[PDB]
Design a protein around this ligand. Structure first.
Ligand code: 4QY
Ligand code: 4QY
Ligand code: CL
Ligand code: K
Ligand code: K
Ligand code: ZN
Ligand code: ZN
Ligand code: ZN
Ligand code: ZN
Lengths: 306, 303
């Protein structure tokens, strides 16, 4: 008999990342199916397919932990997923507990990322860890003394739904700054600026060409003028926004995840640009790239059931 | 054992002595001597010696300061006390008083003492907010203060106005106030009792005190009513941003402006529009130890 198997899902806009971990926490399955962002019955279908297929492959009933890009209402279980309008308002935990006939744990994706990153031996004893996801949206997971702070209403770490601070707006032209609409239905949330999507939207606003983030970064590496101006602006915008956040939270370690965390220039430029925007006595946190690559979410979700 | 706590203020120095059972047995209140650093130091030193002489012992010394002691050098950054800026307070006092001294941020001390109240025992998180000469925060998670990598945790006063607050204040026409930290537009200069006054004076060109403006508001005077409506909305917008980041279970307000009772009625009404749809309000309460939370938290550093 296989024993206990822990399944984790990291749900994104585009793909559902699935992982199965055995009794020793060795990853023994890895799947990536398309995220159905049309039907909700189909979104459920994808999740449900993955668990049953894995059930049949190892011949067990795995536990199910799910990391979602949003929040499950603490009273109703209904989802708020700002960059997934498909899933908005659904009782995901109950609906999956129905279809799968077992308990399901649901947590925010950045919380799961921060939890798994902070449980690494090098970080487990740090007094605080901030996990930041820069993907389709901007999300945070807050760990204090090794325990996730999920907040009054599962909102802790929702830095993506804070508005651009004055010094960022000044950088972007003040009354001429682009004010992007947000999936939360507010406007000017940093979710729409510091994410990989926001990086792209800012380029398009200033330069009127809809390039992807990888394309803009390749142009930057060739020293192309528009991309260089964009990247300079973006690095300063990211430093200003993070300096504000760090003046509030003052984390010991910041771990970055999501697609835009692979832009290596970030780790060189933040330490240079942050000091101007921090208090005189501030000391920089250690700012590091995710140590589990793109798997932090899957692992943290699986490990909810530990 | 006698435990001394000092809460050092923009305006005044609060002193308290707690006996072995933690009963408050001394209370003194001197003005904060913010002209000279010699005079600042002297006041603290006077209060310890006087209390030493009165109870005939050498009590422990915990101090809550409106600022940060550099984690590496011990030098102070006190944005609204230019007198103390740059000084090695802990070592200077340990010299003059010939015993160890603990130094912590004033809002940290306030939050710690408020969070250890029986009513708040077991809350997963507490945010203590000081709205005084400046704006300060103390973050408590599972009963323990998070002081941060460099003793900056909870420095929400030195975050800049968010876009929705600037829009409320006129965007490119919004007043951008200079800050004691040497940045500009920090909320320290807007949501504090001082900032409340500076916003009134910017819009109405009269330098009234916060109590005077509030009294005029209570009479229904037009300028004060406009100001208070603007202020309440500004406070809700700024705190909604902060609560979307921190999502605290309980928010305890302290400092002079926490006595403006309208705040407890208006925040719950005005916060929801600016929070996420699934946000639930934190319990928003007035300090349960009145003006003593800082003194008690400071004293109890040495517990
Ligand atoms: C209220 C909300 O929906 N906030 C979400 C936040 O919960 C989430 O952690 C963050 C990052 O997620 P992503 O993997 O890029 O899709 O995206 C924000 O927009
Ligand atoms: C960098 C700094 O000086 N920040 C301070 C902060 O540490 C402090 O908690 C806050 C409140 O203090 P107050 O009782 O009004 O005099 O005032 C802010 O200005
Ligand atoms: Cl004060
Ligand atoms: K989060
Ligand atoms: K603080
Ligand atoms: Zn938003
Ligand atoms: Zn190209
Ligand atoms: Zn400041
Ligand atoms: Zn008057």
């Amino acid at each position: 008999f296989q024993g206990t198997m822990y399944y984790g899902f990291d749900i994104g806009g585009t793909k559902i990342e699935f992982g199965a971990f055995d009794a020793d926490l060795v990853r023994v399955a890895r799947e990536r199916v398309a995220t159905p962002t049309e039907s909700y019955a189909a979104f459920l279908d994808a999740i449900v397919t993955l668990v049953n297929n894995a059930d049949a492959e190892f011949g067990v009933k795995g536990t199910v932990g799910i990391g979602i890009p949003g929040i499950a209402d603490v009273e109703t279980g209904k989802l708020l997923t700002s960059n997934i309008p498909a899933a908005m308002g659904h009782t995901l935990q109950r609906d999956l507990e129905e279809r799968l006939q077992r308990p399901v744990k649901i947590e925010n994706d950045a919380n799961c990322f921060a939890l798994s990153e902070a449980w690494d031996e090098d970080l487990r004893g740090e007094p605080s860890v901030l996990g930041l996801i820069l993907g389709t949206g901007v999300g945070g997971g807050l760990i204090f003394n090794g325990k996730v702070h999920s907040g009054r209403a599962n909102i802790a770490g929702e830095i993506g739904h804070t508005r651009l601070p004055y010094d960022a707006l000044k950088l972007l032209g003040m009354e001429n700054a682009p004010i992007f609409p947000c999936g939360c239905k507010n406007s000017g949330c940093i979710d729409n600026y510091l994410s990989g999507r926001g990086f792209e939207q800012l380029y398009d606003h200033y330069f009127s060409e809809k390039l992807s983030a990888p394309e803009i970064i390749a142009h930057y590496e060739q020293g192309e003028r528009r991309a260089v101006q964009h990247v300079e602006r973006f690095m300063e915008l990211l430093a200003i926004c993070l300096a504000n956040i760090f003046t509030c939270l003052d984390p010991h370690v910041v771990v970055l995840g999501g697609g835009l965390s692979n832009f290596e220039l970030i780790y060189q430029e933040l330490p240079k640009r942050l000091p101007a925007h921090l208090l005189h006595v501030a000391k920089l946190p250690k700012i590091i790239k995710a140590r589990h690559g793109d798997a932090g979410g899957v692992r943290g979700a699986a490990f909810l059931n530990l």
